Design a protein around this ligand. Structure first.
Ligand SMILES: [Zn+2]
Ligand SMILES: [Zn+2]
Length: 83
């Protein structure tokens, strides 16, 4: 009945089934890598890709804020839907 609008699935009408929400992934410094390393006891999150580079430039604190770097641990966050 009335749900049949006069259109056609020429290419595709129902392709719009993607949400595209919030990407919980990614490192702010590079945007390509994700939060792989957590700087302790700072609690800052980024990828070792950026962090090593910064320490190769003397790791005078996190690359952003330059706050306390003592230790580092791996992260690996949950993707869920990074689409
Ligand atoms: Zn990065
Ligand atoms: Zn920090």
């Amino acid at each position: 009945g009335s749900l049949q609008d006069h259109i056609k699935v020429t290419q595709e009408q129902y392709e719009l089934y993607c949400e595209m929400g919030s990407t919980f992934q990614l490192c702010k410094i590079c945007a390509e890598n994700d939060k792989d390393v957590k700087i302790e006891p700072c609690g800052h999150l980024m990828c070792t890709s950026c962090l090593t580079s910064w320490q190769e430039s003397e790791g005078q604190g996190c690359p952003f804020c330059r706050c306390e770097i003592k230790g580092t641990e791996p992260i690996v966050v949950d993707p869920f839907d990074p689409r």
